[PDB]
Design a protein around this ligand. Structure first.
Ligand SMILES: *[C@@H]1O[C@H](CO)[C@@H](O[C@@H]2O[C@H](CO)[C@@H](O)[C@H](O)[C@H]2NC(C)=O)[C@H](O)[C@H]1NC(C)=O
Ligand SMILES: *[C@@H]1O[C@H](CO)[C@@H](O[C@@H]2O[C@H](CO)[C@@H](O)[C@H](O)[C@H]2NC(C)=O)[C@H](O)[C@H]1NC(C)=O
Ligand SMILES: *[C@@H]1O[C@H](CO)[C@@H](O[C@@H]2O[C@H](CO)[C@@H](O)[C@H](O)[C@H]2NC(C)=O)[C@H](O)[C@H]1NC(C)=O
Ligand SMILES: *[C@@H]1O[C@H](CO)[C@@H](O[C@@H]2O[C@H](CO)[C@@H](O)[C@H](O)[C@H]2NC(C)=O)[C@H](O)[C@H]1NC(C)=O
Ligand SMILES: *[C@@H]1O[C@H](CO)[C@@H](O)[C@H](O)[C@H]1NC(C)=O
Lengths: 49, 109
């Protein structure tokens, strides 16, 4: 939408949780589990491929 | 709100004009400009409680902390009407110490 403006990635993930109706404390208080789940999900794609 | 469906930027409004066998759309959009960098933090710890912005981000100009809206820089001081509380400050990665100002009790002298 213009020039790239940097933001830390967990804070971008919190904006995106807001965009679906969940408060952002739910992301910050679960950060490690959410990242573990994303990593297992990405590791399952290359296994199916 | 569909990205790039009505031009580049944040769609404000669009005007139609007729062409021969066709149509022309003049899209008016909003484009952000002249950014500055800041230090930032996800929450703020005060009295053993974690505070999150209601809307906006916590930013630091070098020595002080403010809340701003995310798309236009307009800094304000962090109060209990700017933020909400959840939990204690032991679980959030990158939490920062600052004071969150209450209006009522300095009204009550
Ligand atoms: C929410 O669901 C997750 C499942 O992804 C739970 O986390 C797992 O809990 C089991 C316990 O049976 C552990 O063995 C796993 O190692 C956990 N997974 C990860 C990625 O940490 C989590 O406990 C659930 N939360 C609640 C409150 O029920
Ligand atoms: C960050 O902004 C603050 C403004 O709040 C500057 O601090 C001073 O703060 C006092 C009381 O809050 C004001 O009376 C002053 O007018 C403010 N400015 C000055 C120049 O004294 C602070 O200087 C700013 N810091 C940086 C690094 O820009
Ligand atoms: C951002 O990354 C920096 C590393 O570049 C982290 O700084 C380190 O913090 C640890 C404490 O967890 C210290 O032991 C290291 O000495 C620091 N390294 C440097 C180079 O400063 C910083 O903590 C990270 N920020 C967050 C919020 O995790
Ligand atoms: C932010 O403020 C809290 C509140 O005091 C600090 O917590 C103290 O941390 C030190 C060192 O980690 C401990 O020795 C104290 O026992 C803690 N106090 C309490 C009341 O728990 C915290 O360290 C501060 N954060 C930073 C980065 O300085
Ligand atoms: C912000 O700082 C970075 C270096 O950390 C620099 O590359 C960038 O151009 C700066 N942008 C602004 C708007 O100051």
């Amino acid at each position: 939408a213009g020039a790239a403006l940097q933001i830390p990635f967990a804070m971008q993930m919190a904006y995106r949780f807001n965009g679906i109706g969940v408060t952002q404390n739910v992301l910050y208080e679960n950060q490690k589990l959410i990242a573990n789940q994303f990593n297992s999900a990405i590791g399952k794609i290359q296994d199916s491929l | 709100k569909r990205v790039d469906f009505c031009g580049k930027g944040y769609h404000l409004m669009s005007f139609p004009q007729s062409a021969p066998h066709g149509v022309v759309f003049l899209h008016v959009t909003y484009v952000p400009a002249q950014e500055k960098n800041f230090t930032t933090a996800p929450a703020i710890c005060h009295d053993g409680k974690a505070h999150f912005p209601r809307e906006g981000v916590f930013v630091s100009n070098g020595t002080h902390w403010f809340v701003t809206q995310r798309n236009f820089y307009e800094p304000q001081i962090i109060t209990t009407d700017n933020t909400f509380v959840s939990g204690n400050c032991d679980v959030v990665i990158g939490i920062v110490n600052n004071t969150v100002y209450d209006p009522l009790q300095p009204e009550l002298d």
